[PDB]
């Protein structure tokens, strides 16, 4: 599924991401935009052999098990397939655990390079929330 901007903003808000551990809703929408372009079925095989899955491109080397990555720590205790659903519940729950680490949202390269430092709240502007 390819989310519409305000559609995703509302979903993420319902899923408790607005101001989760200090990160305003706009941060999450922006991250989803630059990581997957709002596409829940996005998958990108990394060089090291791991794969990024879902709307927030969560990597299989540490966060989920795709049963094909030798390292796989599966910290979110979930099959990576669960991150490819049109139901973002699994991705959000995993993202919350990820961001709860010391690195926070820096775990996402796209956010670090395209969102951090900008007016991220622009990403939810014009949306009824």
């Amino acid at each position, epitope marked *: 599924k390819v989310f519409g901007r305000c559609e995703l903003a509302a979903a993420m*808000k319902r899923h*408790g991401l*607005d101001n*989760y551990r200090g990160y305003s809703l706009g941060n999450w929408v922006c991250a989803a935009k630059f990581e997957s372009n709002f596409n829940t079925q996005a998958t990108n095989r990394n060089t090291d052999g791991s794969t990024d899955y879902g709307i927030l491109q969560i990597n299989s080397r*540490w966060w989920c098990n795709d049963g094909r990555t030798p390292g796989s720590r599966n*910290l979110c*205790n979930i099959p990576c397939s669960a991150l490819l659903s049109s139901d973002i519940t699994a991705s959000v729950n995993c993202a919350k655990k990820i961001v709860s680490d*010391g*690195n926070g949202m820096n775990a996402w390269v796209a956010w670090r390079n395209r969102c951090k430092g900008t007016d991220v709240q622009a990403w939810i502007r014009g949306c009824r929330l």
Partner: antibody
Amino acid sequence: QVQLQESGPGLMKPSETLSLTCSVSGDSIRSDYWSWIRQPPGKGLEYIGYVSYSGSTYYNPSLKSRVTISVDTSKNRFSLKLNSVTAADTAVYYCARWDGDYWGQGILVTVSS
Amino acid sequence: EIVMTQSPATLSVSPGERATLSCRASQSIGNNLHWYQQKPGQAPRLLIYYASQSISGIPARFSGSGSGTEFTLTISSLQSEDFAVYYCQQSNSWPYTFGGGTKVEIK
């Protein structure tokens, strides 16, 4: 089938350092986030802090930088250290997996002046 | 820190009755609210996570609802083994905080 078990001294004197450990079975200590929570007698629950996969820690400001949480990957367990204890620290101490799915059974630590 | 307030402090329930427990947050916490059940001499047991998500093995009579600053735990038809102290806990902001608890006891 995951099991957490707290261990350590159940009695101590004021000003001393409280030291507890939580051993895990059925899960890898190096593969998750781990927490400590306490419950003073007849009172509610107070979150002490947690350590994440990268080793980063988060401590409750109410403890005034007196707390340390560390991981011993070699023995699949993590510990809690609380310096300069007083009667206010008497409580049942619990360890749990960060997501909350599994908790230890708790260990009573009494600071008897 | 976010202050969590539960009500009532004590809830008398007759076996078979519907039980409604309330938990409010001093500020919005989205759906980042978890419910725990604690029986005497036992550790708290997670029943509901992220306000309404159910946990495998937990009876269907337990249901969580609410968002923002007002949350509710409903036991559709309380059974005798449900008597215990229930706590809510928010995870939206560090330090994580627990409500003061609601002691559910037989009537």
